[PDB]
Amino acid sequence: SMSYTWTGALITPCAAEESKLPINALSNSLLAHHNMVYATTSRSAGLRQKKVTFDRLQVLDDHYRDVLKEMKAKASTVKAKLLSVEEACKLTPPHSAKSKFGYGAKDVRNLSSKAVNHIHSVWKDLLEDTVTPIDTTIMAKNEVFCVQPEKGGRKPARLIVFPDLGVRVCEKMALYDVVSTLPQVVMGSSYGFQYSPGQRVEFLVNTWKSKKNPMGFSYDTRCFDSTVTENDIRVEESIYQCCDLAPEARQAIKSLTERLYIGGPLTNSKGQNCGYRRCRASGVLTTSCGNTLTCYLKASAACRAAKLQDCTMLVNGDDLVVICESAGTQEDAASLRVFTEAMTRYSAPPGDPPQPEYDLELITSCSSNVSVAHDASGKRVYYLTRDPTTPLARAAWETARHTPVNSWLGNIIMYAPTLWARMILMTHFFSILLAQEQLEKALDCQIYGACYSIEPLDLPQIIERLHGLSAFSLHSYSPGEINRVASCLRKLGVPPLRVWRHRARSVRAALLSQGGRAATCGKYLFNWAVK
Amino acid sequence: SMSYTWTGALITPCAAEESKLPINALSNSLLAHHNMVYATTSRSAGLRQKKVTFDRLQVLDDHYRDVLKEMKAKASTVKAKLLSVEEACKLTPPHSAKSKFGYGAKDVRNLSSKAVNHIHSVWKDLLEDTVTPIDTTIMAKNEVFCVQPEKGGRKPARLIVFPDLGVRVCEKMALYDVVSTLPQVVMGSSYGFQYSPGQRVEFLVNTWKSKKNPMGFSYDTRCFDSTVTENDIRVEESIYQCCDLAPEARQAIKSLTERLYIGGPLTNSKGQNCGYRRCRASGVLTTSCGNTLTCYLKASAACRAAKLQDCTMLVNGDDLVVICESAGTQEDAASLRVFTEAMTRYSAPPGDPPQPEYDLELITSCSSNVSVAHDASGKRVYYLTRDPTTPLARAAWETARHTPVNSWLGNIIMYAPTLWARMILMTHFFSILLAQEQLEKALDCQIYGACYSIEPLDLPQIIERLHGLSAFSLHSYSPGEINRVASCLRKLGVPPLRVWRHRARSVRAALLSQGGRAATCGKYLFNWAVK
Q1: If we measure between CA atoms, which residue out of B102, B243, B249, B239 comes closest to residue B175?
Q2: Domains of chain B, CATH where assigned
Q3: Which entry of A69, A348, B45, B378 is 20 to 30 Å from A275 by CA?
């Protein structure tokens, strides 16, 4: 079946779509090559549509079936409860899309009459009608990136398909408790979302050291969401069904998969029919869970097909990393291909061919990799890093706009231990916060799903609880890490690491002298700044 | 063991405390005998303290033990998950008490740095330290009532003991999922909170008709909270422990019961040691669950001790109603006494001696009773009512005050089918809403725990969903109900039912003419007003 079937209708935007990075004298202070940072818009839609639209031919085998039966077996040990309309409401995110029926997120979070009522009926309908395809709207996501000449350079806006607040809350009622527990029960340590940056590192590093001759590789599937077959979606349902669920939950889950998950009609921000979807929707409660489950199912069977030894997989979304015992370089190269052969057979073709890695640091999963540094006492400390291009590009942008989302603050927290987050992000922004008076002003920062209200003067406490303290005194970064960062900076036209060391020196001072709490930041976040 | 040991420290207030009822053109228009409506204050504290302070001598027997083992057996079929700090935060009520550590409810609901951090440590402490008695503050609740020389008029302010935001959220993390599921699994249909007003009526009426010669009685325990023994609290814990829980959950539950539930130090709003508690705290997540469980345990064993036939119990808090087969009037009178004899033996002495009832309407549980009326087609319709004194008194007060909760709106919704809620509350307030312009202005109304933001123009939809429609066309109220209401009004000095019929007539008109939505109210809420 075709992943999508479109219809002349254009995927229209809903507000002003920014294209170029705004020219700020302060942003220039961090990014001079602004003509390399761009945001995606509806205009790319067409390009995107051609990338995600194709026929899927899936063929399963015993490897697949055995893994699936094994999974169901474990799913059958799970018990999940229905959430009440109210609970499901208190769990809906603060800035979700308003509903086409007169109410928004605030309204939901407040248990307003309008919302609560609508939900209830939307719920009564799921239960009573289990066939009418549910409506979803398709949009072109606006995300900031940096040009990459080595290839197409500019990437076409991502496409997001979502069902509508009312329904979206009903999903929670029916699957919130499942989407949670179930993934981790089925794949144990393989379920990536259970780990924090450091626990991820700890799990990867321990697994790596557990092989006599470790070989690892990340596998990237081409437009994973579009590779998901109705078969896949139904298989997910069967697994969810193996759980001990309330009768009403079963009805909704079945109904939701037939009326939404399996696929459905796509419609404009203008209201016109845009086409039909026959693959995964990106905007449903079930997306991450289903993708993890499916990616894991396929990958497991593919591993068995390639006869990989001591496989250990880490799966997040469509994101997948495998680590095993090397059978020899030539032997691994063949394995990989058989792996990817079976993988595409399962309808999960690769984007760029997987390459075997023998150097843990060179393995990138979830856009990140493991690296080494040393702590004060001088011991080895493994932390998680990533190329800083995107975090920087976005840092820039969010410096030249109010942008209600502080991705920068997110990276400062998630990558606190890293060389770049410490010397640049922290410096650069604690700079602006000192300049202005907004040092006590909380900021909305999104991370691990949730949206937090973070007070800058709390970073020390957060970072400590997240990474340990080592994070305030790490040094001697791997030559490769240091090299990549420095490189990245030239490309983006940002001040060199030595300049930041300076800007930090003052920051540490202006802060240390400005009080106690702020001093505490100066002491910890910038302890490295001076000796 | 003494329920409390005080220490000459006064239970101090926290703000201003209104005692007398405020008047105005509007309030007198609904209540003329204002000198009968009063609010409780810290001043009654002393009286209250003497009422709740006494020694408890509990003695158990096989009846108790058999029911307890039966309960555990069912509890052992329950699986409960830990909530994450974030989830527990999104579940904390909007206007809870601020924390003595720099953050409030809004802060918690927003996942602010300050709160999230504190919680985490509060949680790490519960796990690590399982003995230090946790601190709780004691207050004097301010509630509105109507005088009644029926007994020693004027009731002393209720006392509330609570642990503090941080801890309070940790309770949710550990027991939210338990406190939910567990109660209903153990006592099936006996668990009262599972029923809506109508389902309660349906459950009572069905049970009543199921006996050849029904006999029913509500049992009121004297200051139930103070009758709970450490034994009782530990027994609760053992039951919670029978569940399939995460290791961390067990640690916290055990810790919380030893450091909080079991008992602890009480302290002023000023900060001074007020005394020590050795019984149930009124302000913990565990109160309602524990009370239901314990009340049910004792009651069941007491029922067996009294050899009651076909017992069926409905338990809410400390609230208890039993319905059984009558063994004869004289035979039942004896049974009751043996029941209450065994009940006090279990440390649950009666306030006012229980009296056997043979007329379902005369049985009041949860401050309510079942009553009959007829719908449009003329069929019999059973609904739930209660004496309107308190709802009226409070309706008055809240008319001459802003008040964060529209108790009145709560009663209008919970008792929509009742004669009084319909002819007075609805009329009186839709009146004020028409007078002023606040007809579309949502209002904060508390019900079934939650705090909703209700838009007045939505009552029809809510009432319908809650009661059925019959609620808009019921008539021919039992003579006793009509009698009680009318009586109640004279006492409170409120306009007679005929006057309200008039005030309603206009309201129905002013509304019907003012549009569509508002018209819809006029059509439904006031359809009775004119023929």
Answers
A1: B249
A2: 1-55+133-163+263-278 (no CATH), 56-132+164-186+229-262+279-285 (no CATH), 188-228+286-366 (3.30.70.270), 367-531 (no CATH)
A3: A348
Cα–Cα distance between A191 and A315 in angstroms, integer?
A: 6
| CA–CA gap between residue A418 and residue A475 (Å, rounded) | 10
**Six-digit token string for A96:** 């979700």
Longest CA span, chain A: 69
Alpha carbons B216 and B322: distance in angstroms, whole number: 6
Any known ligand binding at B164?
Answer: no
Do the Cβ atoms of A454 and B112 come within 8 Å? Answer: yes
Give the nearest chain B residue to A444 (CA atoms). B112
A88 CA: distance to closest CA in chain B (Å): 10
Place of tokens 């390459």: A355
Question: How determined?
Answer: X-ray
Report yes or no: B236 and B286 within 8 Å, Cβ to Cβ. Answer: yes
Q: How far apart are CA A102 and CA A114, in angstroms?
A: 7
The answer to whether the CB atoms of A453 and B79 lie below 8 A apart is: no
| Alpha carbon distance A488, A494 (integer Å) | 9
Helix, strand, coil % in chain A, rounded to nearest 5: 50, 15, 35
Helix (H/G/I), strand (E/B), else coil: A290 = helix
Give the Cβ contact number of residue A440 at 10 Å.
11
From B112, B180, B451, residue closest to A455, measured CB to CB: B112
Q: What burial class does residue B389 get, using C-beta atoms within 10 Å of its C-beta: 0-12 exposed, 13-18 middle, 19+ buried?
A: buried
Do the bridges between strand B264-267 and strand B136-140 make them parallel or antiparallel, or are there none, so unpaired?
parallel
For residue A121, what are its two tokens?
A: 């009926």
Q: Say if CB B323 and CB B215 are below 8 A apart.
A: yes
Task: Name the β-bridge partners of A452.
Answer: A445
Strands A320-325 and A136-140, sheet pairing: unpaired
What's the count of helices (H) and strands (E) in chain B, helices before strands? 21, 14
State the Cα–Cα distance between residues B60 and A247, nearest whole angstrom: 40
Q: Which of B113, B451, B462 sits opposite A117 (nearest CB)?
A: B462
Q: Where are the beta strands (DSSP E) in A222-272?
A: 264-267
Cα–Cα dist B497/B421, whole Å: 11
A182 and B CB contact within 8 Å: no
Phi-psi region of A439 (alpha: psi -120 to 50; beta: other; left: phi over 0): alpha
CB contact under 8 A, A465 and B181: no
Residues sharing a CB contact under 8 Å with residue B33, sequence separation 6 or more, in sequence order: B491, B492, B493
- Bridge-partner residues for B383, per DSSP? B371
With residues binned 3-state (H G I as helix, E B as strand, rest as coil), the percentages for chain B, rounded to 5, are 50, 15, 35
Contact B173, B91 (CB under 8 A): no
* Interface membership of A194 toward B (CB under 8 Å): no
Contact call for residues B347 and B56 (beta carbons, < 8 A): yes
- CA–chain centroid gap for B255, Å, is 27
Is the Cβ–Cβ distance between A33 and A308 less than 8 Å? Answer: no
Contact between B420 and B388 under an 8 Å Cβ cutoff? The reply is yes
Q: From its phi and psi, is residue A28 left (phi > 0), alpha (psi between -120 and 50) or beta?
A: alpha
Angstroms from A117 CA to nearest CA on chain B = 7
Q: Which residue of A has its CA nearest to B194?
A: A84
| CB of A412 closer than 8 Å to CB of A425 | yes
Structural element, H or E, at residue A113:
helix A113-128
* 3-class DSSP assignment, residue B331: helix
Cα separation, A183 vs A191, whole angstroms = 7
Say how far apart CA B375 and CA B149 lie, in whole Å.
Answer: 38
Contact B452 A111 (CB under 8 A): yes
Mutate to test the interface with B, among A453, A455, A520 (most CBs of B within 10 A): A453
DSSP 8-state symbol, B181: H
